[PDB]
Design a protein around this motif. Structure first.
Motif, mmCIF file in Angstrom:
data_model
loop_
_atom_site.group_PDB
_atom_site.id
_atom_site.type_symbol
_atom_site.label_atom_id
_atom_site.label_comp_id
_atom_site.label_asym_id
_atom_site.label_seq_id
_atom_site.Cartn_x
_atom_site.Cartn_y
_atom_site.Cartn_z
ATOM 1 N N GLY A 265 0.812 -1.195 0.000
ATOM 2 C CA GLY A 265 0.000 0.000 0.000
ATOM 3 C C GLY A 265 0.849 1.250 0.000
ATOM 4 N N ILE A 266 1.850 1.278 -0.886
ATOM 5 C CA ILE A 266 2.739 2.425 -1.038
ATOM 6 C C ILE A 266 1.946 3.715 -1.088
ATOM 7 C CG2 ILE A 266 4.329 3.597 -2.585
ATOM 8 C CD1 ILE A 266 4.064 -0.103 -3.027
ATOM 9 N N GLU A 267 2.334 4.664 -0.249
ATOM 10 C CA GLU A 267 1.772 5.997 -0.315
ATOM 11 C C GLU A 267 2.392 6.761 -1.477
ATOM 12 O OE1 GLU A 267 2.641 8.687 2.864
ATOM 13 O OE2 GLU A 267 4.761 8.156 2.997
ATOM 14 N N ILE B 218 -2.902 5.810 -2.254
ATOM 15 C CA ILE B 218 -2.172 4.561 -2.130
ATOM 16 C C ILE B 218 -2.281 3.833 -3.456
ATOM 17 C CG2 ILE B 218 -2.171 2.304 -1.075
ATOM 18 C CD1 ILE B 218 -3.044 3.954 1.501
ATOM 19 N N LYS C 167 -1.456 0.650 -4.364
ATOM 20 C CA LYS C 167 -2.042 -0.687 -4.442
ATOM 21 C C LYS C 167 -1.131 -1.676 -5.163
ATOM 22 C CE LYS C 167 -6.001 0.795 -2.708
ATOM 23 N NZ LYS C 167 -5.771 2.259 -2.826
ATOM 24 N N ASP D 9 -8.392 0.192 -11.011
ATOM 25 C CA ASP D 9 -9.263 0.030 -9.853
ATOM 26 C C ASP D 9 -9.838 -1.384 -9.808
ATOM 27 O OD1 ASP D 9 -10.431 0.957 -7.524
ATOM 28 O OD2 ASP D 9 -11.951 2.174 -8.525
ATOM 29 N N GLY D 10 -9.705 -2.050 -8.659
ATOM 30 C CA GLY D 10 -10.196 -3.400 -8.478
ATOM 31 C C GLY D 10 -9.248 -4.496 -8.928
ATOM 32 N N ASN E 113 -7.929 -6.950 -6.292
ATOM 33 C CA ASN E 113 -8.885 -8.013 -6.026
ATOM 34 C C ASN E 113 -8.890 -9.030 -7.150
ATOM 35 O OD1 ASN E 113 -10.488 -6.670 -3.594
ATOM 36 N ND2 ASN E 113 -10.235 -5.121 -5.193
ATOM 37 N N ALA F 114 8.840 4.411 3.216
ATOM 38 C CA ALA F 114 7.487 4.847 2.893
ATOM 39 C C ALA F 114 6.465 4.108 3.735
ATOM 40 C CB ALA F 114 7.201 4.635 1.409
ATOM 41 N N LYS F 115 5.242 4.640 3.767
ATOM 42 C CA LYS F 115 4.100 3.924 4.332
ATOM 43 C C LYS F 115 3.712 2.841 3.328
ATOM 44 C CE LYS F 115 2.332 7.302 7.563
ATOM 45 N NZ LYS F 115 1.875 6.990 8.946
ATOM 46 N N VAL F 116 4.487 1.753 3.336
ATOM 47 C CA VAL F 116 4.367 0.745 2.290
ATOM 48 C C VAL F 116 3.072 -0.042 2.436
ATOM 49 C CG1 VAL F 116 5.396 -1.427 1.484
ATOM 50 C CG2 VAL F 116 6.801 0.578 1.744
ATOM 51 N N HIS F 117 2.495 -0.076 3.634
ATOM 52 C CA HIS F 117 1.172 -0.632 3.870
ATOM 53 C C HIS F 117 0.151 0.499 3.963
ATOM 54 C CE1 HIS F 117 2.403 -4.870 5.459
ATOM 55 N NE2 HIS F 117 3.252 -4.437 4.545
ATOM 56 N N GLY F 118 -1.125 0.123 4.015
ATOM 57 C CA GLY F 118 -2.163 1.117 4.247
ATOM 58 C C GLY F 118 -3.538 0.640 3.825
ATOM 59 N N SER F 119 -4.363 1.603 3.413
ATOM 60 C CA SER F 119 -5.771 1.361 3.101
ATOM 61 C C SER F 119 -5.876 0.640 1.764
ATOM 62 C CB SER F 119 -6.542 2.672 3.084
ATOM 63 O OG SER F 119 -5.890 3.620 2.260
ATOM 64 N N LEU F 120 -5.515 -0.636 1.787
ATOM 65 C CA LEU F 120 -5.723 -1.520 0.651
ATOM 66 C C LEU F 120 -7.131 -2.091 0.608
ATOM 67 C CD1 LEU F 120 -2.296 -3.344 0.976
ATOM 68 C CD2 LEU F 120 -2.881 -1.546 -0.654
ATOM 69 N N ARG G 265 -9.919 -0.090 0.462
ATOM 70 C CA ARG G 265 -10.762 0.809 -0.311
ATOM 71 C C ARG G 265 -10.676 0.572 -1.813
ATOM 72 N NH1 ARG G 265 -8.475 5.680 3.379
ATOM 73 N NH2 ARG G 265 -7.065 5.844 1.584
ATOM 74 N N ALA G 266 -9.922 -0.424 -2.266
ATOM 75 C CA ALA G 266 -9.759 -0.644 -3.694
ATOM 76 C C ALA G 266 -11.081 -1.018 -4.344
ATOM 77 C CB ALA G 266 -8.736 -1.741 -3.936
ATOM 78 N N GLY G 267 -11.287 -0.521 -5.559
ATOM 79 C CA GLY G 267 -12.523 -0.769 -6.269
ATOM 80 C C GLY G 267 -13.700 0.041 -5.784
ATOM 81 N N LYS G 268 -13.450 1.055 -4.952
ATOM 82 C CA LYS G 268 -14.520 1.806 -4.303
ATOM 83 C C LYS G 268 -15.472 2.407 -5.321
ATOM 84 C CE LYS G 268 -15.224 5.592 -0.987
ATOM 85 N NZ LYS G 268 -15.656 6.834 -1.685
ATOM 86 N N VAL G 269 -14.981 3.338 -6.130
ATOM 87 C CA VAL G 269 -15.877 4.088 -6.994
ATOM 88 C C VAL G 269 -16.313 3.257 -8.183
ATOM 89 C CG1 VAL G 269 -14.885 6.237 -6.250
ATOM 90 C CG2 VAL G 269 -14.007 5.154 -8.312
#
Lengths: 184, 144, 258, 67, 60
Positions: free
Chosen positions: B57-59, B67, B69, B89-90, B93, E1-7, E9-13
RNA sequence: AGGAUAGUGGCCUACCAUGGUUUCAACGGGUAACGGGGAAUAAGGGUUCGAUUCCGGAGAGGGAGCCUGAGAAACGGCUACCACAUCCAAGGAAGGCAGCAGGCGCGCAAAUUACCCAAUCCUAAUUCAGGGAGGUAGUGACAAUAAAUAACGAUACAGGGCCCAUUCGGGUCUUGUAAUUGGAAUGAGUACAAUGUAAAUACCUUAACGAGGAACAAUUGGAGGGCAAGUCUGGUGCCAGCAGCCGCGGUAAUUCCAGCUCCAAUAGCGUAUAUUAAAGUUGUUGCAGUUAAAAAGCUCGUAGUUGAACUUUGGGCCCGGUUGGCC
RNA sequence: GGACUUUUACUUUGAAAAAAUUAGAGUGUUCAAAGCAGGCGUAUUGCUCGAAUAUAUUAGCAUGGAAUAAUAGAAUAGGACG
């Protein structure tokens, strides 16, 4: 082992793609001469550029240079034989000047339209590809022809198709059968 | 004067001087050295298969906040560890894990494209299934 | 490659046979003979691509085996025998006699001639030596090796032969001011009336040579071929007589013969 | 249409000089039946691995395969 | 880096998007026919020549 | 000097002199190096590639050796060793696809275990046989050529000249705009067939059958700029995501995700990587060196590169060719 | 043939540089890419142009020149004509 068949294109893409002037000019040409492809337009411009390069690097040379004489006279000969050039302009500067418009008006489709067998250059295109035509005594289904003027004298419709007789038509026979069934 | 000699029998000096300055040049160097083949991961190849191991989850670099992804990958012929931008996007998954995916570069010849630091590569297939096709449902992934 | 060659591709076969770069990726290899590989015309390419008397090598082998054909007064029933320079061939069918000479365009021509013009030929002496038991002899440009000729006959001379034997009808020496024929170079097929020469002792005897339009050039003394004396050729000559007009002059020629 | 025509001095001349495929498509002859080229090569390899007529090997294989 | 995080929220929109589908229309001219339409739209059709020849007039 | 060789010759030996190459880069190392003919690319100069259809070389799994032979250091020939690998009625036996097909594995990355000798050629004792050499067909969006997907008349609107200048009436004719309508119009695909070809299968030919778009339905990129193409609708809210570079998005997104529209190219278009032009950012042509990176701390000095001026001018005499120039 | 022919670099011309390729002549593969075929008859004897030309680096051979750059020359003359 079998010596490979030579292939070489007959066109060249634009150096710089998106120039609105270039695009609108060539669109005018396509929409008047009944074309589908910037490929065709580039192709004709590429031929013109080749012959023009020849013209430049020939008139660079002195008079009575037998290379200049032979090649320029042959160039004159094919240009008059195809009709893009006249029968009285053999000085090589008209060759420097000649136009894609000249090539296009010497093409077959707009020639057909001038001769009046079309009612529209697009009608000429569809007639050509449907073989309602022959320039000599053999049918042709290619717009891009570069006629040799003997064809021009010898133009007619397809003998082996209506508009030169010899058959009423596919849908003609269809309609005739339709009305035969209706009367039956 | 000017530096560079001008005599008619000094072509040796000229060749060797230019040789040194070409070593100062960029592409001559890596070309004559084979960096792409001896030190680079791919081996100078346009694409490369790979095995995902985990997700990341690289910023995003500034000025931006997101992020990206991406994922973490290992190759096969080499066994070097690589990151790859799951682009759209997606798609994460879609490409969850263990997939014998295909990777390529971005388009900047050994550098990161945008706000995606440390990354030169992206994903293009999933076990022989293209990600745009997966993203637009023109196709669907072999489940296993 | 571990031994003699046996095959021959097209595009290693020479230019002047005019063999086409299509039609199978292999060519007729001239089997060894009294002439070289390149300045030689196989009978297959002759019959199949000069006359069209046949279309295929099978047909040509039928011809050679039924023996309508004969070279040097002999049948020569091989499909790829070297028909070299100057050579004679006699065909009972049509009662023709073709001669193998060159054209100015750098090709083996087809010189239709009669039986006596076949029954004599020409041959350049390649060298002279003394065989065993004191038999002086010479050898020509067509592998023919001949004994007890005139001592006056020396190197670079030319001989006119009976073709029923290898003996001599007559001979012509080499000296300044004699009619010749060219074999080698851009001048392939010229006829240019020796004007003088030059030695350069150690190699490459050179000859300055010009045809009757005053047009001169220079050639190697082993590429030239003396055909007799100035004026009279000892044979009949093909269209052009070794002239090499301009591209435009030949254009005008054909345009007159439209 | 345009092609190549060839008349012969007589039928027998044509029969001897012309190709077999040409004669048989004209109907002047019979196309001899053969097996697969691979099968011709197969039996060729077989009798290449065999030496001699074969009667001796036949009698020997008989006496051996008797038991 | 913040190599992890909000994974997560993918595919949200793309999931949240309200699905709308392409309305129907006849199959359009192809090739030279399309270019014919373009010429007769751009030049003999004087539909947008205000000062500078826009092509996608937003509703004005 | 002799031996060997088919032959010269350290090719090898006996003996003898101690020499030979080197900054004019020897020798050693590396090479995703077989070389060349050539290919891309350009004003010139050039840079890069070139296993790869033709030429010359090398090799047959690595090495060594040798028989036969004119010709091999043969490998679709023998002998051994090495690593591979097979059949065993366990005593033994037979092999080297970098030939054609084909398979495993390697991978980013690559075809049918087919027909024929009809041709092109080759081989034999020989016209007659053989030939995965070769040709043929199959897969084939590697690359190249041509070129369909649609059009034409009239019917409802809007024009531009001219005539009447009898008003704003006609508008003769326009050229388009069209939930207008009609025809004729053949192709793709089906072919009966003939033709094609060794036999074919394909191409072309033409019967018979084969359109009005729902028909037989052209995609691939993109719309803020460079860079042509939305101040359109909804959704989202610096999240999701886009974007080569710049940048967009933190509740009115001209960039995101969808609908619509529009432009580019078109049966192709994009993407990734290498390479050329661009690039006078390799600079011989033709770079920079005060401060932008860069003048050795200073001097000497070998090789190297470069190195002042001078030694036959002059005139006459003729000659004959090219160019025009009278006629 | 006897003979002195002090040395080069340079420059000119020619022979030669395997084809294919490249540029390019002609050529209606229905145009075109291609390929090198084709064209004309009295269509029975048949007639008939073609498949050019150019390029080919350095180096090697000959080659006219003698400017340019050096290059030794006979000085306690073993000096040339003799």
């Amino acid at each position: 082992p079998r010596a490979p068949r030579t292939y070489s294109k007959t066109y060249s893409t634009p150096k710089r793609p998106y120039e609105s002037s270039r695009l609108d000019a060539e669109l005018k040409l396509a929409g008047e001469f009944g074309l589908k492809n910037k490929k065709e337009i580039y192709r004709i411009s590429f031929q013109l550029s080749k012959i023009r390069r020849a013209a430049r690097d020939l008139l660079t040379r002195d008079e009575k240079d037998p290379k200049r004489l032979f090649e320029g006279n042959a160039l004159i000969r094919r240009l008059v034989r195809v009709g893009v050039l006249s029968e009285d302009k053999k000085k090589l500067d008209y060759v420097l000047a000649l136009k894609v418009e000249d090539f296009l008006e010497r093409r077959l489709q707009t020639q057909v339209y001038k001769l009046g067998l079309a009612k529209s250059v697009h009608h000429a295109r569809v007639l050509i590809t449907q073989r309602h035509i022959a320039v000599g005594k053999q049918i042709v289904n290619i717009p891009s022809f570069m006629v040799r003027l003997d064809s021009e004298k010898h133009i007619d419709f397809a003998p082996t198709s209506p508009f030169g007789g010899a058959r009423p038509g596919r849908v003609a026979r269809r309609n005739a059968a339709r009305k035969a069934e209706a009367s039956g | 004067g000017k530096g560079k000699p001008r005599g008619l029998n000094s072509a040796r000096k000229l060749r060797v001087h230019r040789r040194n300055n070409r070593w100062a040049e960029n592409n001559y160097k890596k070309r004559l050295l084979g960096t792409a083949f001896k030190s680079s991961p791919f081996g100078g190849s346009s694409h490369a298969k790979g095995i995902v191991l985990e997700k990341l989850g690289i910023e995003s670099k500034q000025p931006n906040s997101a992020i990206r992804k991406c994922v973490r990958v290992q190759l096969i012929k080499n066994g070097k560890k690589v990151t790859a931008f799951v682009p759209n996007d997606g798609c994460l998954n879609f490409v969850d894990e263990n997939d014998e995916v295909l990777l390529a570069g971005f388009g900047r010849k050994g550098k990161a494209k945008g706000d995606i630091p440390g990354v030169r590569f992206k994903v293009v297939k999933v076990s022989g299934v293209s990600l745009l096709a997966l993203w637009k449902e023109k196709k669907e992934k072999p489940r296993s | 490659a571990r031994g003699p060659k046996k095959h021959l591709k097209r595009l290693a076969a020479p230019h002047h046979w005019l063999l086409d770069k299509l039609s199978g990726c292999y060519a007729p290899r001239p089997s060894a003979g009294p002439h070289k590989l390149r300045e030689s015309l196989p009978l297959i390419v002759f019959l199949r691509n000069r006359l069209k008397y046949a279309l295929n090598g099978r047909e040509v082998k039928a011809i050679l085996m039924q023996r309508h054909v004969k070279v040097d007064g002999k049948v020569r029933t091989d499909t790829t025998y070297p028909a070299g320079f100057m050579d004679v061939i006699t065909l009972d069918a049509t009662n023709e006699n073709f001669r193998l000479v060159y054209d100015v365009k750098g090709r083996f021509a087809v010189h239709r001639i009669t039986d006596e013009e076949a029954s004599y030929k020409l041959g350049k002496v390649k060298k002279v030596q003394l065989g065993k038991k004191g038999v002086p002899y010479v050898v020509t440009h067509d592998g023919r090796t001949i004994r007890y000729p005139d001592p006056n006959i020396k190197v670079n001379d030319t001989v006119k032969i009976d073709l029923a034997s290898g003996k001599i009808t007559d001979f012509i020496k080499f000296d300044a001011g004699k009619l010749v024929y060219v074999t080698g170079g851009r001048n392939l097929g010229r006829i240019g009336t020796i004007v003088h020469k030059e030695r350069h002792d150690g190699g490459f005897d050179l000859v300055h040579i010009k045809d009757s339009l005053d047009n001169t050039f220079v050639t190697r003394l082993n590429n030239v071929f003396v055909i007799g004396e100035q004026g009279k050729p000892y044979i009949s000559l093909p269209k052009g007589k070794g002239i090499k007009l301009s591209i435009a002059e030949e254009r005008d020629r054909r345009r007159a013969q439209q | 249409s345009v092609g190549f025509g060839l008349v012969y001095n007589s039928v027998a001349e044509a029969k001897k000089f012309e190709p077999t495929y040409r004669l048989v498509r004209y109907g002047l002859a019979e196309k001899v039946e053969k097996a697969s080229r691979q099968q011709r090569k197969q039996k060729k390899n077989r009798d290449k691995k065999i030496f001699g007529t074969g009667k001796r090997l036949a009698k020997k294989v008989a006496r051996r395969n008797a038991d | 880096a913040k190599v992890h995080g909000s994974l997560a929220r993918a595919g949200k929109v793309k999931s949240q998007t309200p699905k709308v589908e392409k309305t129907e229309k006849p199959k359009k001219p192809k090739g030279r026919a399309y270019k014919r339409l373009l010429y007769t739209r751009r030049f003999v059709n004087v539909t947008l020549v205000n000062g500078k020849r826009r092509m996608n007039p937003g509703p004005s």
